[PDB]
Structures are given as C-alpha cells and as structure tokens.
Structure 1
C-alpha cells in the first residue's frame, strides 16, 4: 500500500496548473453561494426534521415540568 502499484488504470488523461499561475479564490462568491444553496437544499429535508422534533419535545418537556411545579386549587 504505497504509490507505485496501487491499482491499474488506462486511457485516462488529466491536466492541472501551477498554484502560482491561477487564482486561489476563483469566483469564491459567484458560484460558491449557489453551490451552498444547492447542497443545503439537497440535505435540508433529511437533516432538519429530526432536529425540529427534538426542538418541539424539548419545549414541551420544559413547559410541562414548569406546569407540574405549579400548584394544582386543592
């Protein structure tokens, strides 16, 4: 497991450039923000609801505990 015999690959042509000839932040905001919104839209529906149900149960538990501490007119 080291460089030299990792695997076999053929007919692959790859290009790149020197770090001293291209911008380090190529339009960091022109496509960065749309990319962020795209990933957020992709993951929001599967990330948020488990946290929102936790938010509701936390609030309900806190309020019910406070109510239980109050006297219950007896």
Structure 2
C-alpha cells in the first residue's frame, strides 16, 4: 500500500493528454535538439578535461616507452 501514504500535497493542478492525442517525439528541431546541445555544452567542460588529461599521459608514456627501445648512437661512437 505504497500509494497514498507518501506525502502531504496541496494546491497543484496538472493537465496531461492521452498519448493518442499527442505526438510521440514532438518538436525534434525547435525544442529537442537545442536542449541536447544545451546539455552537451553544460557538461563538456566538467567531463572532457580529465579524460583529455588522461589521453595525454597515455600518449606520452606510451611513446616514451618506445623511445626507450630504440638505440642511442652515442653508445657506439667508438666501438670500432
């Protein structure tokens, strides 16, 4: 019996329409896509950063490791 003992609510009217009287995916352009961008925008700078900073570390350590495999001529400039 979880519905009815939830909370004390007063003076709130809500209006909704049967699903068959309205569109399933309305205003894809005018409304939808703009918010998708809005949201992407909002977060991009909180998320992306640390990911990009990881990418570097990856790329750096990944290559620096390869560099440590190649030889350095300065070890043989007299090995005749």
TM-score by length of 2: 0.85
Instruction: In structure 2, list runs of 5 or more residues that go unmatched.
Output: 76-80
- Which consecutive aligned stretches of 4+ in structure 1 deviate over 4 angstroms post-superposition? none
Q: Return the structure number with greater strand share.
A: 1
Structure with the greater relative contact order (CA < 8 A, sep ≥ 6): 1 or 2? 2
Q: Return the structure number with greater helix share.
A: 2
What is the rounded CA distance, in whole Å, between the counterparts of 1:37 and 1:14 in structure 2? 29
Corresponding position of 2:14: 14
How far has the Cα of 1:41 moved from its partner? 1.0
What is the rounded CA distance, in whole Å, between the counterparts of 2:37 and 2:25 in structure 1? 19
Structure 1 or 2, whichever has the larger Rg, is 2
Q: Deviations over 1:37-67 (max 9, x none)?
A: 1001110111111000001110001110000
What is the rounded CA distance, in whole Å, between the counterparts of 2:4 and 2:62 in structure 1? 60
How far has the Cα of 1:17 moved from its partner? 0.6
The total of aligned residue pairs comes to 74
- Superposition RMSD in Å: 1.2
Corresponding position of 1:71: 71
Instruction: In structure 1, list runs of 5 or more residues that go unmatched.
Output: none
Corresponding position of 1:28: 28
How far has the Cα of 1:31 moved from its partner? 1.6
